[PDB]
Amino acid sequence: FAGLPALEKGSVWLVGAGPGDPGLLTLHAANALRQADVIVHDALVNEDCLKLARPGAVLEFAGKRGPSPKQRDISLRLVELARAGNRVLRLKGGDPFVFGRGGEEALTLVEHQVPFRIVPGITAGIGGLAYAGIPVTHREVNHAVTFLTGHDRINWQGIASGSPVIVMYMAMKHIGAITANLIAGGRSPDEPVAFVCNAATPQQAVLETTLARAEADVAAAGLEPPAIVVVGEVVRLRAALDWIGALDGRKLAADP
Template sequence: MTSPDPAPGRVTLVGGGPGDPDLLTLAGLRALQSADIILTDHLAPDVSTLVNGTEVVNVGKTPHGPATPQEEINALLIEHARAGRHVVRLKGGDPFVFGRGGEEFIACADAGVAVAVVPGVTSAVAAPELAGIPVTHRGVSQGFTVVSGHVAPDDPHCHIDWAALAQSGTTLVLLMGVRHLPAIAAALAEGGLPADTPAAVVTKAASPAMQVVRGTLATIADLAVSNSVRPPSVTVIGDVAGLDLR
């Protein structure tokens, strides 16, 4: 007599928000509490007190440090789901905002694994907001653009039109931009953004160690260095960065 096949498993990609477990969505919390295993990111909130002993495996990537290859993460999701488990992939922010959630969704779907997505609060909005900076504000900014600063402006793999962003008249939010902030600020200045445009860097948002450094386009890169700013940080450039609504 053969044993029955395991019940079909599934994967849920959960956005964990900017770092504080209190900023998880209710749908995200429900998914976590129904999980058989959780694969978590470096920037995801600590949910150990919320899941009653469920196995939590860190597969995160650290800037210029240890990292689990994306292909290995994809394989783990599929392996555990095929074993009949509900796998929650917990990510910082929102899974589809520089979180490689789309790649993981496609990998699971291509493997025939049921996969769903629970949106999360993106740090692109939450980090500035926690620092008292609205990314839009009537009479100040009618929109905002979120870009990755992971690739330097002069790198051939950078496809961002910094000159166009400098002329947009809207708020610019940079994720993963600390390392290349001097070059990014220079590219925006070269594109015509005034040197006195307000700017701010928010580090470790939604944590007790949150730090806010304020300056201008001309000074923010040096201020980030002098204040020992490190990832994870979100940079806001535009007139709204001169506001402090706290």
């Protein structure tokens, strides 16, 4: 059960690995993983999906090695590999277009007449949250959701007003500033907030707190990247929708 497009040559697929749990891979991803000659991957939350790679052909780490590689180089590696006839698979955490420089990579690709495909992935801000029992939207609660990165140019007031649920990528180092920005924008100090670290991995960990207390709580809990930060009433649903908790003993409750 796979009659789907082949990973060709002079070509690169920018492929979403999801937040960690393999099997949150798309069938397109699994297939690409099966046929790539070379895989240029990130900081992977699960190094598990790489077990799918075809009879050992080159793995290529592209994250921090110790210094860094600037995107420019990573992108230009893809083209180098592609022009030399490899089936190239650029393997990205989560979804390639949700804060993952994927648009940059693809722009470079066309800029050098390299054909590409994009394979969407599960992003930590939606699927990861799901593994914590927190939906990004729920009828009674929100008709909008904003997804943002911590480093701004970011209209903090417009987000504060306007966005009943807020979902934050790379906001650990700045959590103190950000929550203070929301509170001053008219958000309640007591508004529920949740941190989810290593969403959808066996190392998953959750902090339930509050806009006013968030900075003290995550210092105290000793929490660390990678983490999605979510703000808003939907946090209250975790007590009721934590299906992972339910697998061990958890007694799931009713909404408010």
